[PDB]
């Protein structure tokens, strides 16, 4: 329906810089605004942040100031501009795409990250 | 009202035609005035279009290309084409959209060679 | 598509109710199966019972239970505060021979988390363009449900005073608006549109209801506004000239 | 055991052919076809047996593997009704029905005479929203959310307002009161450039 492979990730030494694209494909005309959670070894998936199209940005306890999230428009990849690591951040990272048109979510494969030190 | 096309043929590649279209009635609706395009197995979709509102706008790669224009009267409307692509071969349906619907043509075939 | 029947057709609780899900089948066939079919997914099969007393587990199945007894029910039931159940509930029977399975109509089932939240869609009928009158000849009333949670209303739109199903269209599933939350509330609009004729015949009265499903009795409110009970909204509207 | 059905989706116009596949590794004995409308269950389209074989029943036609491996299931000249989730299945693996993912079918239809046009609904009563409708425009303009949030728009849908053989794509947006007009509700999707916005 839409469907959003998301791209780049892998491993990182703390304080790096990461930057996840998500490649959204397919109708995304849809989608409501986008969004990356991330869901760890023991847990349920914690919103990270989101943006919107046309573009805003919530952020999400977590890192709230030092994950930027963007987004562009052109390729329809949407960034997850992750300037700082600490090791309490490795999580799956999936990317989320949630319209208020039914089915109200899609979600896509999921990226690690994982950050040892 | 009715709208009377003229103007097709077959051509070559790399061709020169122009696709005109007779009318009748309002010219004190108007709203904007296209072409568009019927490729057997599609449906149709957008070629030209001339708006009161806005300019000319184009597009399908039959941008850099062809060009619409209309006349004074908007007693007629006229497609040029220029380089045909063999891609294009079709049966053109011409259209002027106006406040009371828009009204259509009965259409004409293009050839466009290999 | 069989003749089998599984009510009631919608169903509501608060988080932390059991409830059961009936299902009863009139032809004979030993195998009983059932659906949780979660939005825009495919089926899980969560138990079946081949015949009676044998039951064994689906794909899914942590934290529900369906007992046999009889070859013609088969009780689903539910046990709270699991994983938030709430998706579609589809049962199924077979004859075993070839494995060809027909289905029920089905159970939605919502569970919510707090119980404030539920309302009853308003809802109201947006009467039609004098512009898309003049210039499509035909008249789209659109009717904007608005407003309700959960998703498990079913509109339909009745105008002098029979229902029509005659260039009516819903929007097959509703819009949730803001999806990030859970326990939004939801709004549907659906179409009707007749020709201009008869949109501008005042003697018609188009309107469109919704059921709402909504709060049984014996839930507990305490809140201040009316408490929401499976209720009907309508709006309506005359046609009007021109 | 597993089997796998692609598409994940297809689209295809009214009236083209089409085809969705479905396969595995491991042979079955049986395999079946279901067409799933949304809360109506898998109803059964038919059931084929035997290697090769081939079932038409009507506009489907539906054929089996020879070794029993895959199995195809092509329309012929889709329509509207053919809108929908088409899920393959197979026996089990002690007797428990396997689900392809199934294709969702979107058939759209054939507007022939499209007319793209939003228009403003609205009302004498209460309620203080007030939505604009985009219809009659062409399968293939995809109708994007707002980036406002106050807007929504609803997804196409299309109507079959038979007797004149009419179908017609809409969507309709409403944005909360805001102070919207009409013209900026779907400046973010892109739009056909003949669509009649009306005074
Ligand atoms: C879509 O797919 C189908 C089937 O996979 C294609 O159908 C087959 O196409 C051929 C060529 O048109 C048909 O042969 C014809 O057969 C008869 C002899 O029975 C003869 O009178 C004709 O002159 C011609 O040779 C074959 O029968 C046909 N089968 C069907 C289902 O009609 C098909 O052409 C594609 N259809 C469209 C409309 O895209
Ligand atoms: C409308 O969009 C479809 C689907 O395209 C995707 O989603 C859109 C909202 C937009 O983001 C696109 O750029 C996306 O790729 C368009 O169909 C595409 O058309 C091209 C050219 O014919 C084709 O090669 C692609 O494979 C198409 N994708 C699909 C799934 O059909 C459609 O033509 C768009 N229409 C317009 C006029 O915008
Ligand atoms: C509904 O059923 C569930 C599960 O059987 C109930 O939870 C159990 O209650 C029994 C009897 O009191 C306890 O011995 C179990 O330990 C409980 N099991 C679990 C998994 O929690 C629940 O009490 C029932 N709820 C209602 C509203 O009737």
Redesign the pocket.
Known sequence: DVQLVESGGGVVQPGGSLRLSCVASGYVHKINFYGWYRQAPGKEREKVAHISIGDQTDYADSAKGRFTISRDESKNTVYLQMNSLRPEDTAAYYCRALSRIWPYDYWGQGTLVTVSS | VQLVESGGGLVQAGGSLRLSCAASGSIVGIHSVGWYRQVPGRQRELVATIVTDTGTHYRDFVKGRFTISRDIAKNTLYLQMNSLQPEDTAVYYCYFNLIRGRYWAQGTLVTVSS | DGGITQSPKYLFRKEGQNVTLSCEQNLNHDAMYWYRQDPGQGLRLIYYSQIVNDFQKGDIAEGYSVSREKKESFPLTVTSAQKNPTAFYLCASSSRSSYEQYFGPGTRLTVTEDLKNVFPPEVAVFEPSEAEISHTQKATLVCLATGFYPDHVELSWWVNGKEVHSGVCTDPQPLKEQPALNDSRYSLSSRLRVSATFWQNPRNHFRCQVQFYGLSENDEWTQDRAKPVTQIVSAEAWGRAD | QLLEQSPQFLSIQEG??LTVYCNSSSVFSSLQWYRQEPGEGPVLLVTVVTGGEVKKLKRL?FQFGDARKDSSL?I??AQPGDTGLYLCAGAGSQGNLIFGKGTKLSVKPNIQNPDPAVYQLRDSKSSDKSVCLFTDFDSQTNVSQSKDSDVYITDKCVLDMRSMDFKSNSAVAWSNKSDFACANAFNNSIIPEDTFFPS
């Open positions: 083209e052919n036609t092509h012929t000249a």
